């Protein structure tokens, strides 16, 4: 009885910076900050 | 009426070879 | 020559729509089951079109796609051809060499025995030819023999496709009657050409068909006919329908007229709502060769009296006698039985004529209602 | 499209390796699941195919698989080509040791060891659940084949001791129950049903005891035996399990409603100007008015046809048709009255400018047809009418004119009531697509009119006999049992005379292209007595790959000089008595379809010709 | 002047009568349009646009200008609106029978001496057996036998009467749920 | 960004779909045999799946 | 009368033999496995059968 669960910690501060991006009325900044964030991510 | 059905089939022909 | 008229009633026969590709069910679906709906087959044939053309340029994605159909048509004729094999295996087992006979066309009660001459007509299954074979029954035979004569064969195809995917539908259809005296030979094809579809651009089709008549003993002479139809939806609006087509008949000894008496005509077709109306109308004019006839048919709908259908035709000879037109249908359910009406109404003649149809499946209610014509009968002497 | 197409290239994949795929084999092959997937060797490939084919084949295989994981590896870090690995760990028991079935008593004790044998685990650790799967697939599998649907395995059990114990639990009839439908008539397009044979007489019919297994074809013959009744319209039979051994069959049966009525009414105006005028309406075409009533059974259509109202008695049709399909066990019993019309040929044949004639045989028939065995046909018909002879317009013709006479009573009008026996055996058999064996077909006309037909008896006699080639030697169809039409050699004789006098509308002829080709209708003779005699050879293509078959037929036709004996002898009238010899080739298409090249050595004229249906 | 807002699928059902019968409807000196020449067989070039838009076609990989192998004709449902069957006439009379390869029993599925089916490798277990040991050329009871007029008059007669009589009422040519699906 | 198929996400809503049917059914079988308000008929499932507006628009 | 009244009867009667035989072999398929009686149907319902699909 193996049920396998993944920690989603990467995706919930991509929703939680699309939020606060959104509450702050600069959308168009967003994919400007989200791929930045990503890329730290990789390196 | 041969006139107008004449000029109205050659308007729709142009018209649809247009496109 | 037939008159003028024959030809404007042909040309306006009312809103038409050529006949769009074929697809096959398993190569679309990659495998899966699919269902039914026009815009997204003609898509897909397009689509794979291009995509081959793209991986033939060099893109990768392209040459995925086309090899995943690559791979699911194999499957699916290798499938099919198993299947194929199955179901001949499965022939034979049931009948071990006897081939499946079908059964005899039924003509009709008469005084010869029913039961004569069903041998003749009783044959072997034939092959998966790719014709389709009709008899043709003449009005009156010969006494003591069958009557049928003659023969009609009709095909159908879609070559030029590559992969289940394009193409240009083609239909043919000839009708033979060849005896020691008299040959009847009537031919006919069709062919269709897409240039657009809605993804691509609009929606733009071609038909081009041809019809020749050959009566040899009693006419002596052969006919021609050539029309080519263009539609293409949407010309004035979100959607109209329009189309327009041109006819030439020839009634020359052979090949070109030399001297034979042709015609020439052009058709106009379109359907539009305006407020709580739905017109379809189509109007075409003739010309022979030197009287033009003029031809005119519509039909007209209400969405608030949906049961009620109206027609309006309009005829014009040379220049002038015009003969209108006005039919009305309507239906309703009476009493265990529903009855159906038709009123015609024609104005060069000032003629009404009324049709009730009546079907009653329940009781014979109907039956006692009317009673009439009974009394009405008179011996008279 | 394949590997060795695009050895460089960016983010391609190169190699695809499936590791922890079970091997039980219920489950399709390592290279069938490879062959379904969306990353495909020496193809591009992206984040969303790896998520999206780990998401199919989570779904796909949801029982067996726990957790697909899909990875990545470098093959070389500059050439960016990748190897995509799918590993595949599936649900797991703790230990399982033995396998056994329990129950299933009907099951041999064969089959029970054949398929403990088969299912075996091979390691008693880590036992994956795919085993019970395969051994409950194999069980229902073993009693779907014998015919069973109910029996099924229940559960498993024993796993405390680490015995995979497979419980069957069988099932078997208990209750059975009836119910009455009749559905309504309406157009609302959703059809209403009320809810009301005796009940026991059908349990009687389907036999359906309790305390038994169920069977498909124990339902097919139920099914059989209760629509056996042709009173019923529609059967429905259901073996519903019961909330577990217990199978309740729900039986629905329902009736059919024979009457039928259909009106018709045609109305014309005057209108003039401004409103019509209805005092002279007083009455109206009524068209046809048709009644039908089906009810053992007993078919009964009435159609009476007035062309117009206030005058029915002019331009009036009837038709009458009844039925009797239960009337004897083997044969059906007819009666109809009816109007037929169709031209003569016979009488008024062309080689000339003879202007033809048409029959119109207008009466009552009464026959009774017996179908024994399987191709013998055997009918006894009785028919009195009226028959008339029209040209052109419909005007009564005295006499044929190029006089020979048209009928017997010389006015063009009589009434004839005479009987008509028809005997059919055939022996045929199509083998191959090629017709082998015998027919006989007997006619007798006996003219009981003692009323201007008069004494007449007209007897026919056709036998056909389609026989191996004796020159061609025997072909492998025969004797490896597998593909081959065998070559072959038809006889056809038929024998024609009449006696008494008969009227030149059913006078005997020879001629026709069925009779004989190359000739139009009448053109031999018309004479009493004929022997028409055909011989041809018949060859299927299927060696040369060929489809249809090559013929060639020789074909006399002999009116014994019996033309002088004929009435007011119309072959003298048209010239043409001459016997006939005519011989042609053809080549049969698929079907019936019969093109053949015909030359008639009487005249020295060859024809083209085109026919539909058999030769013989 | 004004369109109806609210339309219903019991409008459309009654549109769909006038819809049916505008084939009927159109009257001229020949009634029915679209004849031949000089013959009154009338031509197959009705392209009416009701008729043509339900209309579906396949194309079958039929093999047992270029060759053209595939074959194009009408296959599964024909319509191009799909409706659900009504759940009527699934029972159908069957008589048992003998193959004639051998004693194996066909009703329905084809069953074999034991109570199991046969199977795809005994079917040809069996015929090659029938190979090997062929008899009987022509001394046997004939398959497939020639079906003549009036046979099954039952069936002629009543089979699926009452689907007639409903479509006489209902002269609507499309279910209805076909209309929703598209 | 990167989506689910729209095939897999259809299939995935009918499954839900009659699973949801399933547990509705399984949900009937137990518990809608009890009475909670005789007044109304409103059974022990309706009354704990917090649908008695239901029941009481229904009457 | 005297020559195509027996014929035929003949293979009729032929014809009903080998009916038989196919029920006498749906017997053992009902033999085997202990399966319970096809219940085969008179032939005053066989012949009515015979108007039928049957
Ligand atoms: C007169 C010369 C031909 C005689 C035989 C004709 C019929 C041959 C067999 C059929
Ligand atoms: C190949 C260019 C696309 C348009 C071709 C139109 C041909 C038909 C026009 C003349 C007939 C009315």
Same mark, same amino acid.
């Given at each position: ?43 | ?19 | ?36 709906? %026009?815009? @997204?087959?003609?898509?897909?044939? *397009?689509?794979?079109? $291009?995509? !081959? ?5 060099? =893109? +990768? ?63 072997? %299954?034939? @092959?998966?030819?790719?014709?389709? *074979?009709?008899?043709? $029954?003449? !009005? ?5 023999? =069958? +009557? ?84 293409? =939806? ?148 | ?616 | ?182 | ?59 | ?54």
């Amino acid at each position: 009885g193996i049920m396998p669960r993944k920690y989603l910690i990467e995706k919930h501060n991509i929703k939680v910076l699309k939020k606060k991006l959104s509450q702050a009325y600069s959308t168009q900044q967003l994919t400007k900050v989200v791929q930045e964030y990503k890329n730290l991510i990789q390196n | 009426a041969a006139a107008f059905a004449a000029f109205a089939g050659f308007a729709f022909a142009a018209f649809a070879a247009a496109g | 020559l037939p008159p003028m008229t024959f030809f404007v009633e042909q040309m306006s026969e009312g809103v038409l729509k050529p006949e769009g590709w074929a697809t096959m069910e398993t190569v679309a679906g990659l495998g899966e089951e699919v269902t039914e709906d %026009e815009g @997204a087959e003609s898509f897909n044939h *397009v689509y794979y079109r $291009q995509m !081959y053309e793209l991986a033939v340029a060099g =893109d +990768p994605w392209a040459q995925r796609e086309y090899a995943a159909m690559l791979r699911a048509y194999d499957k699916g004729c290798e499938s099919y051809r198993a299947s194929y094999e199955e179901a001949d295996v499965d022939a034979n087992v049931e009948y071990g060499v006897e081939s499946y006979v079908v059964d005899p066309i039924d003509f009709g009660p008469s005084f010869d025995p029913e039961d004569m001459y069903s041998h003749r007509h009783a044959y072997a %299954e034939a @092959a998966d030819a790719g014709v389709t *074979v009709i008899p043709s $029954q003449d !009005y009156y035979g010969p006494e003591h023999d =069958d +009557p049928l004569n003659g023969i009609v064969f009709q095909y159908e195809a879609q070559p030029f496709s590559r992969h289940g995917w394009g193409g240009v539908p083609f239909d043919l259809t000839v009708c033979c009657e060849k005896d020691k005296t008299s040959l009847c030979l009537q031919g006919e094809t069709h062919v269709s050409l897409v240039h657009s579809v809605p993804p691509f651009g609009p929606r733009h089709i071609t038909q081009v068909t041809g019809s020749w008549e050959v009566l040899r003993p009693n006419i002596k002479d052969v006919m021609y006919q050539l029309e080519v139809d263009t539609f293409k =939806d949407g010309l004035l609006g979100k959607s109209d329908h329009a189309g327009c087509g041109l006819m030439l008949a020839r009634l020359g000894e052979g090949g070109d007229p030399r001297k034979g008496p042709t015609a020439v005509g052009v058709r106009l077709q379109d359907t539009l709502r305006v407020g709580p109306f739905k017109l379809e109308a189509c109007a075409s004019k003739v010309a022979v060769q030197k009287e033009e006839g003029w031809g005119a048919r519509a039909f007209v709908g209400y969405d608030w009296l949906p049961g009620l259908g109206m027609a309006f035709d309009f005829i014009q000879e040379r220049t002038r006698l015009r003969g209108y037109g006005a039919n009305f249908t309507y239906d309703w359910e009476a009493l265990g039985a529903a009855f159906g009406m038709e009123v015609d109404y024609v104005a060069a003649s000032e003629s009404v004529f009324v049709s009730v149809n009546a079907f009653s499946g329940n009781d014979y209610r109907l039956g006692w209602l009317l009673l009439l014509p009974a009394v009405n009968y008179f011996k008279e002497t | 499209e394949e590997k060795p197409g695009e050895r460089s290239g960016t983010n391609r994949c190169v190699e695809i390796v499936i590791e922890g795929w079970p091997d039980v084999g219920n489950l399709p092959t390592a290279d069938e699941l490879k062959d379904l997937l969306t990353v495909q060797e020496g193809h591009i490939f992206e984040k969303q195919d790896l998520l999206d084919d780990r998401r199919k084949l989570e779904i796909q295989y949801e029982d067996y698989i726990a957790e697909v994981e899909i990875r990545t590896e470098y093959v070389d870090g500059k050439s960016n080509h990748q190897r995509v690995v799918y590993k595949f760990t599936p649900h797991q028991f703790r230990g399982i040791n033995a396998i056994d079935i329990k129950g299933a008593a009907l099951m041999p004790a064969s089959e029970v060891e054949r398929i403990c044998n088969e299912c075996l685990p091979k390691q008693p650790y880590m036992v994956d659940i795919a085993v019970m799967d395969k051994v409950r697939n194999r069980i229902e599998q073993w009693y779907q084949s014998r015919g069973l649907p109910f029996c099924y395995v229940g559960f498993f059990d024993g796993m405390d001791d680490g015995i995979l114990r497979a419980n069957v639990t069988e099932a078997k009839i208990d209750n059975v129950s009836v119910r009455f439908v009749r559905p309504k008539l309406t157009g609302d397009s959703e059809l209403e049903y009320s809810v009301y044979v005796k009940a026991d007489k059908i349990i009687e019919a389907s036999g359906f005891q309790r305390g038994h297994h169920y069977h498909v074809e124990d339902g097919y013959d139920a099914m059989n035996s209760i629509f056996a009744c042709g009173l019923l319209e529609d059967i429905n039979i259901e073996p519903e399990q019961d909330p577990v051994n217990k199978i309740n069959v729900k039986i629905r049966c329902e009736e059919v409603q024979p009457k039928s009525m259909e009106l018709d009414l045609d109305w014309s105006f005057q209108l003039k100007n401004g409103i019509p005028s209805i005092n002279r309406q007083s009455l109206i075409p009524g068209g046809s008015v048709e009644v039908s009533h089906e009810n053992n059974s007993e078919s009964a259509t009435l159609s009476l046809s007035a062309s117009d109202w206030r005058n029915p008695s002019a331009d009036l049709g009837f038709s009458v048709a009844y039925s009797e399909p239960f009337y004897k066990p083997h044969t059906t019993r007819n009666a109809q009255l009816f109007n037929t019309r169709k031209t003569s040929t016979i009488f008024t044949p062309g080689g000339s400018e003879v202007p033809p004639v048409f029959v119109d045989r207008f009466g009552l028939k009464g026959w009774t047809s017996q179908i024994t065995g399987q191709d013998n046909k055997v009918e006894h018909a009785l028919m009195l009418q009226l028959v008339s002879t029209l040209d052109e317009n419909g005007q009564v013709v005295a006499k044929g004119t190029k006089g020979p006479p048209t009928t017997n009573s010389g006015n063009g009008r009589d009434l004839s009531l005479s009987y008509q026996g028809f005997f059919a055996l055939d022996n045929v058999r199509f083998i191959n697509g090629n017709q082998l064996g015998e027919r006989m077909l007997f006619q007798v006309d006996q003219g009981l009119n003692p009323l201007s037909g008069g004494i007449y008896n007209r007897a026919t006699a056709s036998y056909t006999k389609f026989l191996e080639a004796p020159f061609l030697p025997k072909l492998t169809t025969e004797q490896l049992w597998k593909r081959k039409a065998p070559n072959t050699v038809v006889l056809h004789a038929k024998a024609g005379n009449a006696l008494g006098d008969v009227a030149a509308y059913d006078y005997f002829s020879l001629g026709g292209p069925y009779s004989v080709r190359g000739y139009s209708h009448g053109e031999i003779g018309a004479a009493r007595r004929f022997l028409e005699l055909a011989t041809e050879v018949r060859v299927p293509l299927k060696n040369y790959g060929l489809p249809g078959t090559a013929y060639g037929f020789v074909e006399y036709a002999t009116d014994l000089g019996s033309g002088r004996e004929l009435n007011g002898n119309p072959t003298e009238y048209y010239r043409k008595p001459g016997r006939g010899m005519s011989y042609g080739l053809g080549l049969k298409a698929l079907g019936a379809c019969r093109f053949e090249y015909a030359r008639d050595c009487n005249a020295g004229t060859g024809t083209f010709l085109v026919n539909f249906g058999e030769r013989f | 002047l004004r369109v109806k807002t609210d339309k219903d699928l019991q409008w459309w059902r009654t549109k769909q009568r006038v819809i049916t019968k505008r084939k009927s409807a159109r009257k001229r000196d020949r009634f029915k349009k679209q004849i031949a020449v000089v013959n009154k067989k009338l031509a197959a070039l009705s392209k009416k646009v009701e008729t043509e838009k339900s209309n579906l076609y396949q194309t079958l990989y039929g093999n047992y200008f270029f060759a053209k192998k595939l074959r194009k004709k009408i296959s599964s449902k024909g319509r191009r609106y799909r409706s659900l069957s009504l759940a009527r006439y699934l029972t159908a009379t069957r008589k048992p029978r003998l193959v004639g390869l051998d004693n194996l029993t066909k009703i329905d599925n084809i069953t074999t001496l034991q109570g199991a089916f046969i199977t795809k490798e005994e079917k040809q277990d069996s015929l090659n057996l029938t190979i090997q040991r062929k008899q009987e050329l022509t001394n046997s009871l004939k398959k497939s036998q020639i079906k003549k007029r009036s046979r099954h008059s039952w069936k002629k007669r009543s089979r699926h009467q009452f689907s007639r009589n409903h479509y006489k009422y209902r002269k609507r040519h499309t279910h209805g749920n076909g209309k929703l699906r598209v | 960004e990167n989506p689910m198929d729209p095939r897999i996400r259809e299939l995935m809503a009918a499954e839900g779909m009659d699973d949801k049917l399933e547990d509705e059914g399984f949900k009937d079988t137990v518990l809608g045999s009890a009475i909670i308000n005789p007044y109304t008929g409103l059974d022990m499932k309706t009354y704990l799946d917090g649908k008695e507006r239901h029941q009481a628009e229904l009457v | 009368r005297r020559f195509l009244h027996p014929r035929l009867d003949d293979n009729q009667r032929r014809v009903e033999r080998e009916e038989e035989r196919v029920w006498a072999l749906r017997g053992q398929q009902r033999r085997a496995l202990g399966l319970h009686r096809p219940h085969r149907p008179d032939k005053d319902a066989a012949w009515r059968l015979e108007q039928m699909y049957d």
